[PDB]
Amino acid sequence: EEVQEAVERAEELREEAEELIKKARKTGDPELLRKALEALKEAVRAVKEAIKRNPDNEEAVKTAVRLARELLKVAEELKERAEKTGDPRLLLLAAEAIAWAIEAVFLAAKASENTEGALEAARAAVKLAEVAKRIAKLLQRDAKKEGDPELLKLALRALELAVRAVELAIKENPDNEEAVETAKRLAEELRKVAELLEERAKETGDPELQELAKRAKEVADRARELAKK
Amino acid sequence: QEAARLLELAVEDLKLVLDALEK
């Protein structure tokens, strides 16, 4: 019953995000792709709430697979529009659409007891982690070259989802050194962004720059816990 | 469940797109 309502509510948001992509393809607003992304993310939270308390529900497993395909459609167009504009911001949104696609495929593969694809989803999360790190390395250059405080926040957000990516692969297999090394690589990159945030904060004050400079070091602690363990 | 091979291409597609931003 409750699982049925969560699956239905998840399908309501997927078809709604499906029409936003078709509208976004017609020379659409990147916000239309973000609105489709936000709708799909909440839909993934619905099937997660549905797979929990009732796994192996083929309707919930099928719905989780349909979300992963629709999440890649947002990621597909976000990569294309990021290659035209050259904006690393769209590369961040594209990496988020893949991240939730990794979760959606990891939920269904683990629920259907498909160790074949469940371990494959964990390996792709490690590959996505090194992408979000390079995306963060790119947002650090444009935040220094073009001088934008927003780009340093997005650089941290790129590393925060990169830590969540290796957190998914470590939970499945803690003895994966490529995910362990990447966690060590993300930890040191988080301290670089934290030094960038604190320096610019000392020059301009501002509570946000100080708060995110503290959050960057605290995310580096979680990634350091993932690395040493 | 073939999305497992489809997603690893998406993370690899973003690799080449990210690396293509140099030009």
Numbering used by the authors:
A (entry chain A): 2 to 230
B (entry chain B): 239 to 261
Authors' account:
We set out to design proteins that can switch between two well-defined and fully structured conformations. We reasoned that these goals could be collectively achieved with a “hinge”-like design in which two rigid domains move relative to each other while remaining individually folded. The hinge amplifies small local structural and chemical changes to achieve large global changes while the chemical environment for most residues remains similar throughout the conformational change, avoiding the need for global unfolding.
We solved crystal structures for two designs, cs207 and cs074. For example, cs074 (site pair 1) showed a clear peak between 40 and 50 Å in absence of the peptide, and a peak between 30 and 40 Å in presence of the peptide, and both peaks agree well with the corresponding simulations (top row). In a control experiment using the static parent DHR protein of design cs074, the distance distributions with and without peptide were identical and matched both the simulation for the parent design model, which closely resembles state X, and the experimental distance distribution for state X of cs074. To increase both the absolute distance from N- to C- terminus and the change in termini distance between the two conformational states, we took advantage of the extensibility of repeat proteins and extended hinges cs074, cs221, and cs201 by 1-2 helices on their N and C termini, yielding cs074F, cs221F, and cs201F, respectively (first column).
